[PDB]
Design a protein around this ligand. Sequence first.
Ligand code: GDP
Ligand code: GDP
Ligand code: CA
Ligand code: CA
Ligand code: CA
Lengths: 326, 326
Amino acid sequence: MKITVLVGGVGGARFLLGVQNLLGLGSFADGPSKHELTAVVNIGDDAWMHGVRICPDLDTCMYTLGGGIDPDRGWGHRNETWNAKEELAAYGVQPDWFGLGDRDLATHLVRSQMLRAGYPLSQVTEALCKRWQPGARLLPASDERSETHVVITDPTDGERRAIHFQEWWVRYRAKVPTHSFAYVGADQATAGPGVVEAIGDADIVLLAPSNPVVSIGPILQIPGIRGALRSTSAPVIGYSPIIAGKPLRGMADECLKVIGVESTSQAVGEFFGARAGTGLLDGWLVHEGDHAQIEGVKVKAVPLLMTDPEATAAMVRAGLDLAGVS
Amino acid sequence: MKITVLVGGVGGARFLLGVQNLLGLGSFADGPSKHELTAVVNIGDDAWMHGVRICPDLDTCMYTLGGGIDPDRGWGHRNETWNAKEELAAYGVQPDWFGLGDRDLATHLVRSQMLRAGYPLSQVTEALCKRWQPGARLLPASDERSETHVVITDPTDGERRAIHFQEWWVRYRAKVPTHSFAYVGADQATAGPGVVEAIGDADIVLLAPSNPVVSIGPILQIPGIRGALRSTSAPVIGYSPIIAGKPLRGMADECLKVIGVESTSQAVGEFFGARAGTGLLDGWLVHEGDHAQIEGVKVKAVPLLMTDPEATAAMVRAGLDLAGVS
Ligand SMILES: Nc1nc2c(ncn2[C@@H]2O[C@H](COP(=O)(O)OP(=O)(O)O)[C@@H](O)[C@H]2O)c(=O)[nH]1
Ligand SMILES: Nc1nc2c(ncn2[C@@H]2O[C@H](COP(=O)(O)OP(=O)(O)O)[C@@H](O)[C@H]2O)c(=O)[nH]1
Ligand SMILES: [Ca+2]
Ligand SMILES: [Ca+2]
Ligand SMILES: [Ca+2]
């Protein structure tokens, strides 16, 4: 009755909604349910901005599962203003690095106050979730700092520099040469409380169809997490993030391009690799029409579009079935 | 050429406007400036709230002189939203009695980030004033903490408790039994950069008609400040904050009664005292019709209402005339 999903970004929050819908959790619950859902959440995008600690992936899961996301825009709070961001721009600090809405900042004020008072991020999340009540256990992949940076050629002096992923995404992406990722702090981090337990005891471990390099990937750089994934008796089912068939055939993933990986279901599959060898996957699900073949990994094409909680629920069901878990 | 004024918040900023209008400074500038205005600003109400440092008196002066104060509000940004505050409330956090505005939060966020990075308050203030361009030098009375505390009878248990001025002023509105004030940190606080020099090199020092107990008084408890005022070659001219029979906005009547001082123009003058003896004053201006007399103190009744910058400008000149300053 126990599911563990590794998540990051808007895509990860959407996948958890599918999981909740399938198992009657959170907003989809009718009576109190038979299953518990644990999310291991990326902290690679977390940063200190304007003296406050911002954790996007944990916040997006928490807001999404708590029913706080504006349905029209698809991100942020309902009835959101950006007045504090406006005054910051007048002050001269750069505030486009993250949405930084007024309602959003309240979360940041509360979290930063707890962190300064000695509460670890996992407990900070528990405290916020008492209000949001997402219907899932949102575990930060670590309580220690592990921030995704991008190494660029700085155009002001030609030097290699690491830039926080969020600054790279708004300002430098596609505008200067970019050489690699750095996981600043990862080597000094331990897996967050209950993360290795959640991976160890699960009936199944699901990799949401999030960005492989910068959403799932950074979770894997946290010491101990990869080991828990390679050892657990639970089947490990991955979902491909590559959806073909778009107008003009789509665009390659920019973060995959940094590490030189093609934007195909086959390449992302090899990226995570086979548990039978040195990799992470037992199963790899791809969208209708797509193909992959990887020595040791069971691949199945099924509809992989998170159109709505009901479509996402079907996708989760295809994961359980391919694992052989009920 | 050089004016130094000691100020509180709304009263202090309004008086500073009169000085600027008289001397063509700031928003009143109309050609090359011939005088420089320095404000020594109360830091007694400064507090850490929701993890950010609030400097009310410094901000009011800065907002007012910078044209960012909605006239109807009297303090705070114009077109101000309280969304973040509403969210803070949704989260169940304390203190819930103290409203932080969305536009106002940006000031606090920038100040807090800089103070935590090792910047002193004087440097933070100049940094903030580069945007606002107040047309005056806003000197925090100290860069060290010097916070006004209040001894009350707590109405929930009948026990004596000390509380920060913000709780006394904002939460209870001075309507709880109040026994004394404490200037916690004043003896340990060094006079802020340029504050002693501003008092020393001034042609005239003006005590603005701000709260005497909780606005001007707390400045005078900073050991260096009091010494400079009785030491400086400049005449020291004070303005009574009490208009006999004319209740003025604020709680100067409540704060005077705590220290056992009568609410009359003569009484506040006596509180500040005469430089000829143990005091600070050379001159004391009271409203037309009021009668006062302090041995060693030149007293003159003049129109003392800050209805608009021009009336205040007159009030400034009445100071200069009574001093004998051009
Ligand atoms: N398979 C699949 N992937 C999706 C779908 N919607 C979004 N994605 C993936 O979700 C990823 C979004 O990155 P994510 O880790 O969630 O961070 P985000 O940009 O904040 O959403 C993209 O790489 C997409 O390929 C979907 O319906 N199906
Ligand atoms: N003489 C005089 N005093 C005034 C006038 N308007 C307000 N005040 C005084 O200004 C004081 C507030 O100044 P201050 O302490 O700087 O304001 P706060 O910091 O916002 O409380 C009040 O206690 C009033 O007595 C006026 O027109 N004339
Ligand atoms: Ca299509
Ligand atoms: Ca004040
Ligand atoms: Ca000190």
